[PDB]
Amino acid sequence: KPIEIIGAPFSKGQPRGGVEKGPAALRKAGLVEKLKETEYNVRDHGDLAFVDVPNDSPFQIVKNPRSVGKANEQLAAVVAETQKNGTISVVLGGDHSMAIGSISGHARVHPDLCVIWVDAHTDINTPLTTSSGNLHGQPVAFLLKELKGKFPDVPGFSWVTPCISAKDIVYIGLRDVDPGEHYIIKTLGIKYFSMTEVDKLGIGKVMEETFSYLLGRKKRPIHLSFDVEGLDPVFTPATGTPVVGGLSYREGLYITEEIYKTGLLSGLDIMEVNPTLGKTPEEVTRTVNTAVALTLSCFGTKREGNHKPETDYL
Amino acid sequence: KPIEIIGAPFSKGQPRGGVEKGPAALRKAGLVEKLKETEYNVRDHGDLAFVDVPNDSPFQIVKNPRSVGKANEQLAAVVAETQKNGTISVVLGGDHSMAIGSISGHARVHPDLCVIWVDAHTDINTPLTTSSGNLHGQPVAFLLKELKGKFPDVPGFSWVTPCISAKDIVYIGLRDVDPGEHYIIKTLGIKYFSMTEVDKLGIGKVMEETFSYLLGRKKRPIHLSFDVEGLDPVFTPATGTPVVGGLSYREGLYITEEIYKTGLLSGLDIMEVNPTLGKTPEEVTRTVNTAVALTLSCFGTKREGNHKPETDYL
Amino acid sequence: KPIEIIGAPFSKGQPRGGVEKGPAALRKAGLVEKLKETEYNVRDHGDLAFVDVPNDSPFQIVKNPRSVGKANEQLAAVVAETQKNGTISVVLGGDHSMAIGSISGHARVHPDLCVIWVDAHTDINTPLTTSSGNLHGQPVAFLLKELKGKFPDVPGFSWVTPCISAKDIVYIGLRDVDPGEHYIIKTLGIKYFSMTEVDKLGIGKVMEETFSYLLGRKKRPIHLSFDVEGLDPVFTPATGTPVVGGLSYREGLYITEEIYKTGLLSGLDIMEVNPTLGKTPEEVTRTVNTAVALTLSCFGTKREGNHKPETDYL
Ligand SMILES: [Mn+2]
Ligand SMILES: [Mn+2]
Ligand SMILES: [Mn+2]
Ligand SMILES: [Mn+2]
Ligand SMILES: [Mn+2]
Ligand SMILES: [Mn+2]
Incomplete structure (x- = not known):
């Protein structure tokens, strides 16, 4: 299979600057060279160049709506394209709003x-x-159908079409949910696993369930939108919104490992890595490396080890 | 339901000074303001003023027996009082000896x-x-019936009455048990879950068991005496007796979360936070915050999120 | 039963110097005094003095083959000796190559x-x-039978005799396996538990299985070759080859605790502690202490506590 890396240097998704430098760091850490070393064909599509919407006034509270809608519009296009040619897409973050586009x-x-x-x-x-x-x-x-019409059309997102229903998404690692957001996920009956659940069930059973819940009936393509903030800050420090008491490096890799094992990985998102928010070089290198690590996991790299087929190492 | 906070500025329970500053820090961290933001009525009873017994000579090895017996005698009184009015009591530590009073x-x-x-x-x-x-x-x-008469009456505790039996208490997070203490808990057949048990069973099954073990027959009130030292030192550094290889921040919150879910919380103890033993501001703030956090957990605050009923956030 | 401590100050097993100072640090941390405090007879055999093979030229890539073969030859001798007298041997590392000798x-x-x-x-x-x-x-x-003749005789190991088969060894905590090595362990069908397995099954089930797998039929002596690098670097920092996402202090102690509980402990290896590789005093003391701790675990020390038999602490 083919693997296509698409850098989305974007950051108007949130106030903190730096995230755009994201895909650069990941590459510098050698994501591509390493990916090539797996059983996949790696094609680097490069870094999208986003056009900045001049005079992008705040639609009510929503900031930079037009810039973010144009950034995402453009991405969805590139992603749909490579996805069409049959290659798995791997979008490197800026912030997580690029997920509207990616997904x-x-x-x-x-x-x-x-x-x-x-x-x-x-x-x-x-x-x-x-x-x-x-x-x-x-x-x-913006991606949820059930939430269509539940809010006023936003300047620049007019191109968006609610593609999935609350019965196709599964959350893992939740721990900082605004009140409104909690209502929304309860009302729509969305399937999640808050940290408390991971604690109660253990990362193992968690996947076991998320799978039989999403692939029990039909075996469909899987979209992994991984927000590097889902791991505990100790592991991925250089982020915009760290929240303590989260997934461990081990648990993180277990998910990507189980996901690889399903063979249904269709698209990936390695978002929120902000090279500038590291309190020391270590913290950033630390963050950038577990990010690069999680990715390689989705594409083969097993912790027990990997050997090339048809070769007798003896 | 009503919630009453009672600060117990005491420290003669042990040699290290500072713990009395405990309830102050917790408040400074805003325990009350935050508690108010939950579905409970918060009443701050203030900080008990303990009278210091002059010339409190050591009854054998036991130090400050009279001061500690007067401190606890006074608390049990304030606790019995508010408990009578139907409010849940939440005692902020000094040291853990205040538990004789609280319980x-x-x-x-x-x-x-x-x-x-x-x-x-x-x-x-x-x-x-x-x-x-x-x-x-x-x-x-001092609280155990099975241990009544097993030791010399202590100067000042004459008011104490062994209120519970070894069949009503459950330990979680044990890892530093003196030889004598181990004998005592083995002989009396007390139900506990040493770290090794948490490790073998997982915090999940642990609660599942401690509950069917304490609430299988009758559904009674629950008293949570939480010693901030029960978490690994990494999480609650500013303590008098840190012992490595203990509960994680996640596990800690899982317990308080499952306890809230039983709706039987009757009384709480947030003990051993010692603001002065922090090797850096961070460590104390770190400690004080996970303490404040565990409390809010017992009273609603779920990690998956919380939304106010009857309100349509849409 | 008897316990015999044998220090092996060796380090030509690998390029990084310092590991030879290993057994010294462990002793300084008071491994012997503490061990004595358990239900075992402690005999300190001292530190083997290794003769350095002059002009030890590299057999192909293999470095210091003769020095390492003489170091191990000598150890196997001392170990066979004390093992004969019926005492359990506990070898303190330098590097892990001393395992050829020990085993x-x-x-x-x-x-x-x-x-x-x-x-x-x-x-x-x-x-x-x-x-x-x-x-x-x-x-x-060098210890595996199945791998005999699979490689050219090495200068100095001529004395070695493949003593065990791939059906007698069990790995726990794997996470950095070279491609070749992965082939070897897959081809020979060796039973292991890579970190992913620990994650999936939980340290508990892991031991439960490794035991019924190694002691299901016959109850035989157990050799514990514990490489301090098997725990996450956070816990045992001062090592030559740290690899993140490994066993936790808790899990580590759980293994040594379950192993003690089988009563079949015959020989031990506390290897790779390198006092000089600590980025600060703390890191080394941290490492040296969890090492000393894991040992005491194998010989009684339970986390729930220990009391001396026939003594009424009341
Ligand atoms: Mn996100
Ligand atoms: Mn996030
Ligand atoms: Mn206590
Ligand atoms: Mn304690
Ligand atoms: Mn090793
Ligand atoms: Mn190793």
Whole structure:
């Protein structure tokens, strides 16, 4: 199979600057060279160049709506494209709002995809529930059908089409859910596993369940939107919104490992790595490396080891 | 329901000074303001002013027996009082010897209460088994019926009445048990879950069992005596007796979360936070915050999120 | 039963210097005094003095083959000796190549011993698969029968006799396995538990299985070759090859605790503690202490507590 890396240097999803430098760091850490060393064909599509919407006024609270809608519009296009040619797409973050784009384009080509969202937050606030207008905290609201018409059309997102229903998404690692957001996920009966659940069930049973819950009936394509903040800050320090008491490096890799084992990985998102927010070089290198690590996991790299087939090492 | 906070500025339970500054820090961290934000009525009763027994000579090894017996006698009184008015009491530590008082007063009003003791130590040494005379390491021995008459009447505790039996208490997080103490908990067949058990069973099954074990027959009031030392030192550094390889921040919150879910929380103890023992501001703030956090957990605050009923966030 | 401590100050197993200072640190931390405090007879055999083979030229890639073969030859001798007198041997590392010696001597006296290898690495590279000639990464290859003749005789190991088969060893905590090494452990069908397994099954079930797998039929002597690198670097920092996402202090102690509980402990290896590789005093003391701790665990020390029999602490 083919693997296509698409850098999305974007950050207007939220106020903190730096995230755009994200895909650069990941590459510098050698994500591509390493990926090539797996059983997959690696094609680096490069870094999208986003056009900045001049005079992008705040639609109510929502900030930079037009810039974020144009950034995402453009991505969904590139993603739909490579997805069409049969290659798995791997979007490197800036912030998480690029998920609207990533998930959209992919949805075009595979409308029956299910989404596994590993993150500390739900990011399901609507333009009417956010406290800040940071669109990085509203991604899943633009993609959800059940939430269509539940909020006023946003300047620039007119191209968006609610592609999945609350019965196709599964959250893992939740621990900082705004009140509104909690209502939304309870009302729509969305399947999640808050940290408390991971604690109660153990990362193992968690996957076991998320799978039989998303692939019990039909075996469909899987979209992994992994928000590097879903791991405890100790592991991924250089982030915009760290929240303590989260997934461990081990648990993180177990998810990507089980996901690889299903062979249904269709699209990936390695978002929120902010090279500038490291309190020391270590913290950033630390973050950038577990990010690069989680990815390689989705594509083979097993912790027990890997040997090349048809070769007798004896 | 009503919630009443009672600060117990005491520290003669053990040699290290500072713990009395405990309830102050917790408040400074805003325990009250936050508590108010939950579905409970918060009443701050203030900080008990303890009278210091002049010329309190060591009854054998037991140190400051009269001061500690007067401190606890006074608390049990305030606790019995508010417990009577139907409010849940939440005692902020100084040291853990204040538990004799806390558990006693509460027992008066609800003699059928069971006690869940989350701690690094058993604290079940009798005046005849301690190595030091620190009464903070003997609390459960004054409350236990099975241990009545097993030791010399202590100067000042004459008011105490063994209110519970070894069949009403459950330990969670044990890892530093003196030889004598181990004998005592084995002989009396007390139900506990040493770290090794948490490890073998997982915090999940642990609660599942401690509940069917304490609430299988009758559903009675629960007394949670939480010793901040029960978490690994990494999480609650500013303590008098850190012991490595203990509960994680996650596990800690899981217990308080499952306890809230039973709706039987009758009384709480947030003990051993010692603002002065922090090797850096961080460590204390770190400690003080996970303490404040565990509390809010017992009273609603779920990690998956919380939304106010009857309100349509859409 | 008797306990015999044998210090092996060796380090030519790998390029990084310092590991020889290993057994010294452990002793300084008071391993012996503490061990004495358990229900075992402690005899300190001292520190072997290794003769340095002059002009030890590299056999192909394998470095210091003669020095390492003489170091191990000598150890196997001392170990076979004390093992003969019926005492349990406890070898303190330098590097892990001393395992050839340790396991060999022991095998002489108890040819039916099974080996539990707690380590981050497999250390099963043969002189023909290593990238470096560091023999510390080849120990299990010299001891395995199935790998006999699979590589050219090495200068100094002529005395070695493949004592165990791939059906007697069990790995726990694997996470950094070279490609060759992975082939070897897959081809020979060796039973292991890579971190992913620990994650999936939980340290509890892991032991439960490793036991019924090694002691289901016959109850034989157990050799515990514990490589301090098997725990996450956070816990045992001062090592030559740290690899993140490994066993936790808790899990580590759980293994040594379950192993003690089988009563079949015949020989031990506390290897890779490198006092000089600590980035600060703390890190080394931290490392040296969890090492000393794991040992005491294998010999009684329970986390729930220990009391001396026939003594009424009341
Ligand atoms: Mn997110
Ligand atoms: Mn997030
Ligand atoms: Mn205590
Ligand atoms: Mn304690
Ligand atoms: Mn090793
Ligand atoms: Mn190793």
